[PDB]
């Protein structure tokens, strides 16, 4: 979802796990450590979009 | 689409438990799969190619019999509000996505068992808010609540418009002529169960009017002499195998629309129906239509069984109810019979001749079934069948009216 | 900054431009928005947007019917109006005056 | 050069011509749709569409 | 009888009769438009200084509401005696436009259909061209609503009205107008809740209920959407808010959905508070309902807050201290402010997400819709009677101690007050001679 | 008067009225606070100490449990306090 | 890597090596004479200075 200026709202992190957690016991831990993370982000040039 | 559903867990035969093994959950719905579609997974084109004749699930309803029995333990949200457990297995999460074992930091509450409860969509709002994916449930549900709410075979509706088919249904149809009931009886619960659609859709209409067709044929009012805008089922040799039936297209005389618009419940009275795959096929295809549409009368309580008496949004007794009507197969056959040798079909010789060979199939039906019981009695904790009386067999039920609403339907 | 998240912590006597500068973005922004794709009877491989349906991050419509032409109420393009709008005030400004 | 010319659609032709250059700043209504002010001026050939 | 920072009295009281509806003779609608002064008719101006000839905020009317200024209006915005002066030219103008078709003596008994005016009105004085809607003006109200009649053409009729065969989409018009010299920081202001932006939010009408079916799982991955289902006005519609927030009404604590529920909110107490049983009136529950996107389980959002108020509300229940008929900012931050204190919320009434429950003693009377259905908490405490409001007094007050037969020991009683007193107070000794 | 009102909005929204009424501001740190407020310089260090039990401790000893230097103008050691005098 | 070494005082010394790093963002009181924030982590080599 596009959020918009909403603080509580902005998403840090995408995640997606290969494996299920409550086998590791992971149940309770925080999900950034139990799921993988993407991370790319592109440089644009705000001049060719203005 | 449909926002709301009406549903009825099973019923206990006096024994004190839903009915079904810890093996049938992780046989039948295991695997952390998806269960909500499942139905057809272990059907086929016949009996011949499955293993319905020994062992764990020894006939054709058998394993759709203890889906149903099974989802009566957990489908407590639409009638609680709340997920629970039962014998240390819940959903895995809000969506009821799939079965686990329950976790063992914050267990849910155990459920407390009971038998016939009824359910409703509005109890469980999680479910309204998130339709588009726990679609599939609608169906199932309905299903379920459809076979629960009868002994002997399951209930389901037909009706026929005043107006022709339209082209699509008739386009759709041409494309479908050679295929054998089983084989449509998939699609249509495919169609239905794996996103939301509106009653409005050509598909609806199409797989209403194959009910109707089915029916119709079903009765031996539409034949290869007379049938509805060219299309009419063909069954099988009694001789051989009787229970299979294929579409077909004629030159026959289309029979005339009737003056006005018919419809009715329908169910098999009786239990040769467990073991008779056109009776699941067909009745599981018109409950689709069903499925999508919801009901469209309160059902006739008059002739239910004690459970089923004034059930809320599904059976009643007042203005605006629905006659249920009901057939044994047999009186059916010699009734089809009688109406292929009035069209000329056949000869008088010969009508004779098919009520013994289908008389005869019929018996091992029985002969099978009867036998089937008493090596799974239902005080072993799990029903693969259901259970009955040996004068099941014999009831004539309301067949004369069923054949008459045929009369009545295809003029 | 907290006086981003809520511009009236800035005194207008002491910061006039950033002040207008936060409120012309928080009102000006422009408001995502949603549309459908595809076709149920396929299904839909959507994970977190409800199936056959797309985020969109600008407000949009339907097709238009009959011939386009240049408009000037799209959000876009106020969006455009009030920055230009705004960095003429900029211009104006005592600070740019004085040099 | 307006009304030099012999055609009957010459006034709303000048009238249109400059409406397009104004269509910024001060907006009119167009009768018959699919027709917009910034459509070009010698278009206009039709007495339907003053 | 509290909710969060809500307070309530033990009594209920709403009106007993719903006013129907009645659409607009062409006859009526000339004569308010040629109506010699439109202030108090067609508009009017909550902000009046006599002192000078200036107002800045204006409430508009049924004819007007519907329009949505174009920007280049909203950016530059003119004074009330242009104000004024633009509204009288544009008004007689329409009405030439209306009487060059249609000559009143043919037509003066027919019914203009309240959809197709106000978006033909708002097209007029955006400077559009409005000849597409002059052809489906009126509508035979004997046979059929003013929705149906306009599904009959099931196409994009303009770029701002698209209508399908079911149903009808267009912006929501602006019932609040500001005027050059606007200020949401003044406290003193009357409260628009964003109303006054063009785009506010979206309107859907629809004719039947798989229709709604169909919009909402549009709607679905967007923001809360937001319904009436007592007396939906000119008939049955969704309306989509816009995803943005507004500025100066609490400390950023607000999305425009929001905004909508609490305004709405505050109307349905105020109703409760002054309602009638000689009086019949227009919807008896003035409250939105959210549909989509929404959580049951949680109230640590405003948007929560004040739909689990709502569910109460409908019950015909009224708030201790009396609101004003027209707040001004302060007011509206008072009652937020509130809203999102610390406290339990109520718990009688769940919620469910397109049906309300209503407790069978209320006076509320259900309307022949499926949306509404009786319910039966256990320990409801409430009880039906009116209850009036008293003027604030200048004075501090005196009573004099009765007592009831419970008593309490001392050390009881030190200990209540050792955390409760002003223990080190300042005074004033006055003259004693 | 703008300022004022600000000051108290940033005060409420941090430390509900109804859970604080009965607690002592310190007033060293209420009045550093309120001065870089109206210097428009962030205070958000300030408003986790503004309280203190006077019945266990004096305005300086309440502050001197955190030895370091605050912010610029705001230093505290282990024993004493320098700021500027307002 | 700690608790793989046999020497006592490794939980200290881990201890103050993240202390080390953060003695400008979080600076705390270390109740020892003679010893501060950004004394080199690895020389917490003795009871006492705990």
Redesign the interface.
């Known amino acids: 979802p596009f959020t918009r200026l909403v603080q509580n709202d902005v998403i840090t992190n995408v995640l997606v796990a290969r494996v299920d957690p409550a086998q590791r016991g992971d149940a309770a831990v925080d999900i950034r450590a139990t799921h993988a993370t993407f991370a790319a982000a592109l440089p644009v040039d705000p001049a060719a979009i203005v | 689409a449909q926002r709301q559903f009406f549903g009825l867990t099973y019923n206990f035969y006096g024994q004190p438990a839903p009915l079904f093994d810890l093996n049938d959950l992780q046989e039948l719905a295991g695997c952390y799969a998806r269960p909500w579609t499942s139905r057809f997974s272990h059907l086929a084109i016949s009996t011949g190619s499955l293993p319905v004749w020994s062992a764990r699930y020894p006939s054709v309803a058998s394993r759709n019999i203890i889906v149903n029995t099974l989802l009566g333990a957990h489908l407590n949200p639409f009638a609680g509000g709340q997920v629970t457990s039962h014998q240390g297995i819940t959903w895995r999460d809000p969506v009821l996505s799939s079965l686990a074992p329950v976790p063992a930091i914050q267990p849910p509450p155990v459920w407390a068992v009971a038998e016939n409860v009824p359910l409703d969509s509005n109890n469980y709002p999680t479910y309204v808010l998130n339709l588009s994916s726990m679609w599939p449930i609608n169906q199932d549900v309905h299903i379920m609540t459809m076979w629960a709410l009868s002994d002997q075979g399951p209930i389901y509706h037909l009706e026929v418009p005043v107006d022709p088919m339209p082209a699509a249904t008739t386009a759709a149809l041409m494309a479908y002529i050679g295929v054998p009931i089983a084989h449509l009886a998939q699609t249509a619960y495919r169609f239905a169960g794996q996103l939301p659609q509106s009653p409005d859709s050509t598909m609806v209409s199409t797989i209403r009017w194959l009910s109707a067709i089915w029916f119709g044929s079903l009765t031996g009012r539409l034949n290869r002499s007379r049938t509805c805008n060219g299309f009419y089922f063909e069954f099988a040799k009694p001789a051989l195998n009787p229970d299979q039936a294929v579409l077909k297209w004629n030159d026959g005389a289309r029979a005339a629309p009737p003056a006005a618009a018919q419809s009715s419940y329908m169910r098999c009275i009786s239990p040769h129906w467990q073991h008779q795959i056109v009776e699941v096929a067909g009745a599981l295809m018109s409950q689709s239509v069903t499925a999508v549409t919801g009901l469209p009368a309160l059902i006739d309580e008059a002739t239910l069984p004690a459970w089923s008496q004034g059930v809320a949004n599904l059976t009643g007794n007042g203005q605006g109810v629905v006659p249920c009507l009901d057939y044994n197969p047999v009186p059916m056959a010699a009734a089809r019979h009688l109406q292929w040798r009035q069209d000329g079909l056949i000869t008088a010789a010969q009508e004779a001749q098919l009520n013994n060979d289908y008389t005869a199939y019929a018996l091992t039906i029985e002969r099978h079934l009867t036998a089937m019981l008493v090596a799974n009695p239902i005080a072993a904790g799990r029903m693969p069948i259901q259970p009955f009386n040996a004068a099941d067999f014999g009831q004539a039920g309301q067949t004369a009216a069923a054949v008459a609403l045929a009369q009545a339907m295809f003029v | 900054p907290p006086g981003f998240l809520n511009p009236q912590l800035i005194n207008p006597q002491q910061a006039p431009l950033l002040r207008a500068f936060a409120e012309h973005i928080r009102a000006n922004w422009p408001q995502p928005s949603e549309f459908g794709y595809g076709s149920t009877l396929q299904g839909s491989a959507n994970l977190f947007i409800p199936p056959n349906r797309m985020v969109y991050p600008w407000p949009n419509q339907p097709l238009p019917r009959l011939t386009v032409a240049p408009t000037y109420d799209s959000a876009m393009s106020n969006w455009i109006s009030t920055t230009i709008a705004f960095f003429i005030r900029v211009v104006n400004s005592v600070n740019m005056t004085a040099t | 050069a307006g009304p030099m010319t012999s055609d009957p659609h010459s006034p709303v032709k000048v009238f249109m011509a400059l409406a397009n250059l104004l269509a910024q700043p001060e907006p009119i209504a167009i009768g018959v749709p699919g027709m917009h002010q910034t459509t070009p001026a010698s278009q206009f050939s039709h007495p339907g569409v003053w | 009888a509290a909710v969060f920072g809500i307070q309530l009295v033990p009594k209920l009281n709403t009106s007993t009769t719903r006013r129907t509806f009645l659409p607009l003779r062409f006859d009526l609608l000339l004569d308010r438009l040629q109506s010699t002064n439109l202030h108090g008719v067609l508009y009017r101006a909550l902000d009046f200084n006599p002192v000078d000839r200036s107002a800045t905020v204006i409430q508009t009317y049924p004819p007007l509401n519907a329009w949505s200024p174009?920007?280049?209006f909203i950016?530059n915005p003119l004074d009330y005696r242009d104000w004024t002066e633009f509204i009288h030219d544009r008004a007689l103008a329409f009405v030439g436009v209306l009487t060059q078709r249609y000559p009143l003596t043919q037509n003066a008994q027919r019914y203009t259909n309240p959809l197709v005016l106000g978006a033909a009105f708002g097209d007029f004085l955006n400077?559009?061209?409005?000849?597409?809607f002059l052809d489906r003006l009126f509508y035979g109200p004997t046979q059929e609503s003013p929705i149906t009649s306009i599904t009959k053409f099931p196409?994009?009729w303009?770029?701002d009205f698209?209508v399908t065969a079911d149903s009808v989409r267009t912006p929501a018009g602006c019932k609040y107008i500001t005027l050059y010299g606007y200020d949401p920081?003044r406290p003193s202001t009357p409260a628009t809740y964003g109303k006054h932006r063009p785009?506010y939010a979206t309107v859907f009408y629809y004719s039947t209920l798989?229709a709604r079916?169909?919009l909402?799982?549009?709607?679905?991955?967007?923001p809360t959407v937001l319904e009436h289902f007592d007396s939906p006005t000119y008939g049955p519609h969704l309306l989509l808010p816009?995803?943005?927030?507004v500025?100066?009404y609490s400390?950023?604590l607000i999305?425009q959905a929001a905004l909508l529920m609490v305004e709405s909110v505050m109307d349905a107490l105020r109703d409760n508070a002054n309602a009638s049983a000689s009086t019949a009136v227009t919807r008896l529950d003035q409250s939105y309902h959210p549909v989509?996107?929404?959580d049951?389980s949680t109230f640590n959002t405003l948007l929560q807050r004040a739909t689990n108020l709502a569910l109460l509300a409908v019950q015909g229940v009224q708030s201790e201290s009396a609101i004003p008929a027209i707040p001004t900012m302060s007011d509206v931050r008072s009652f937020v402010a509130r809203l999102m204190?610390?406290g339990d919320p109520q718990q009688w009434f769940?919620?469910?997400?397109?049906?309300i429950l209503y407790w069978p003693e209320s006076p509320f009377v259900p309307p022949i819709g499926p949306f509404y259905a009786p319910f039966r908490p256990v320990n409801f405490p409430f009880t039906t009677g009116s209850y009036t409001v008293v003027p604030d007094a200048s004075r501090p007050l005196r009573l004099l101690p009765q007592y009831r037969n419970a008593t309490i020991t001392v050390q009881q009683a030190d200990d209540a007050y050792e955390?409760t007193a002003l223990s080190p107070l300042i005074t004033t000794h006055g003259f004693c001679v």
């Open positions: 174009h920007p280049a950016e400077a559009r061209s409005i000849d597409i196409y994009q303009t770029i698209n920081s785009t798989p079916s169909r909402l799982a549009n709607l679905a991955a967007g816009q995803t943005g927030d500025l100066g400390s950023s999305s989509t996107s929404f049951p204190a610390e769940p919620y469910r997400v397109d049906q955390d």
